[PDB]
Design a protein around this ligand. Structure first.
Ligand SMILES: [K+]
Ligand SMILES: [K+]
Ligand SMILES: [K+]
Lengths: 242, 240, 241
């Protein structure tokens, strides 16, 4: 991790966040998303799964629909209107490969993002705990999909689908232990992100008996505060840029 | 500077790709743990049946299974299980391997999992094998899988309740963080354990296997000493 | 950054294993020209024909063009043996036992003392995100050193008449973590420029500068990146394993 984080250059108006599961975006980047949509930038979400194995007391057939509805409400709190879920992937056993790359390249060509946001694909989390193979798989495939989306002859079936090549400008990896850049966040954007994250009610409920609002405030409080020392005292969300 | 591993575990499961991985990377620690009354079991993905140049794998596998079981017995390890249907040299990382590992984790309920180095390079700097990369990665992944009720739901159908192992210790890691001090009786048991891989070590040189074993482990223990307050020991990278 | 060590002169046979045409020329062309000038035997093995690499040519047109370019480029350097694998697809090369086996088969065929690969790390030397083709091929080539040396991994190779072979060393071109270099003289640089420029349609697709100019700039930049960490000598950097 860099000792001085640079400001993320702000030359983009369309953002596509690609993540494995509901909650990845809120934990990793929600306040930045809030800041971006407050400034009039368009943000869409692509989720590979519904996070249907992520609540110990809800079986997957119950949990998926619940978390989908929670993600859609969280999105609406930030003024994100386009939220799409892939089909046919299973929370916890997402496999990296050409199939996933192609499904993500499809989404990149559909949305024509200037910035793509992913979630930490490294072997370890920001904290140093071991990361999951779902995060590793989706982040890797997303990074790889950038060049795939831009190349006419890779996944030629996409052309038949009516989707012409598109080259995204950069990828920003949220929650990386090798963050290089940061996004400064104001108090209103923070408040909004707290509401967004708090909307994952049953999910947070599975991990704490505290009010959803309170856990969310604490969580995003930590995220932002622990950027400041590397960013000249400013609360912000750190990203690794590629 | 390596920290002494904490002593808050009574059951250990070691998960490795092949026979000899444990005896080369972790044997002296295992000996010390079982001497203290801790229960250790081994799970091996393959029988290392491609690892002896003058025995064909059909003959080799059974020879090395027997060598591994004897090595284990020298350290007081009685539970030794081998998976079926993986091939020495071409183990593939994926959910299938993760599931087999999570099964064993749920069966054994280990508080400590021991793995063998999954990094790109050996402790020495040399290029590591895809078997080791695959099994170590899958075992690290399997901790969360074993703990989650909904991942591999077929495990519940088998009567295997979710279980959360507390820590993973990676042996032979070039990024070690902890170590286990080893007394002389434990060093002796570990030498006998490695030497039980008689045909394996006999294929790599003409020295007697126990002499070779004494050399190899003497080196392993001494390499830890400069970073462990001069105590000889086995180094581990701790995950969790 | 450490000073780069001179690569030891202890080999006569080299096998370069890469994903695509141009990998060799971009990563290591001036070293190859230096080796062939010194009478070393160099062979190339290409997993694909880089048939998705030219944005106005569909793979069925681009495959044959790039193969001819790659043979022309090799000839500029006095590389005769250029092998292509079949049934991999440019852009979606999959890492695994099957690729390893194909590579081990080449290693046993050629008996190289030094294997040259292209950067398999997640990032290019520049920090830009590497491709899964490069990650896959480099990784499988590094793994194939042991596979080629082991009688029982891929037992079918024995039946094909390929006895085990242990290569000495792998040198990775274009690595962000280089350790050694090969000094390159003016003659070799000039030959490498001609070799890279032979990728005429490919380079013509990437920028609209004359390919000859473009080749000179790219390879000048390669040689100059190494010089300050190599006693001021122009060279090609490698990570040795
Ligand atoms: K997640
Ligand atoms: K092994
Ligand atoms: K390439």
């Amino acid at each position: 991790m860099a000792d001085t984080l640079l400001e993320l250059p702000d030359d983009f108006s369309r953002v596509l966040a690609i993540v494995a599961h509901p909650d990845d975006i809120e934990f990793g980047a929600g306040p930045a998303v809030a800041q971006w949509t407050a400034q009039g930038r368009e943000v869409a979400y692509l989720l590979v799964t519904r996070g249907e194995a992520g609540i110990s007391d809800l079986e997957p057939a119950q949990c998926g629909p619940v978390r989908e509805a929670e993600q859609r409400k969280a999105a609406a709190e930030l003024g994100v209107h386009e939220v799409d879920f892939l089909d046919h992937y299973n929370d916890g056993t997402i496999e990296y490969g050409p199939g996933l790359r192609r499904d993500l390249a499809r989404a990149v060509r559909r949305h024509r993002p200037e910035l793509i946001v992913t979630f930490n694909h490294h072997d370890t989390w920001a904290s140093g705990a071991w990361n999951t193979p779902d995060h590793r798989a989706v982040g890797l495939a997303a990074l790889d999909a950038v060049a795939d989306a831009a190349n006419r002859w890779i996944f030629p079936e996409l052309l038949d689908e009516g989707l012409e090549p598109w080259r995204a400008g950069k990828v920003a990896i949220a929650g990386s232990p090798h963050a290089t850049h940061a996004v400064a966040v104001d108090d209103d954007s923070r408040d909004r992100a707290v509401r967004s994250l708090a909307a994952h009610d049953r999910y947070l409920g599975s991990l704490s008996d505290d009010p959803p609002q309170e856990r969310a405030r604490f969580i995003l409080g930590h995220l932002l505060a622990a950027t400041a020392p590397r960013f000249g005292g400013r609360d912000g969300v750190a990203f690794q840029i590629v």
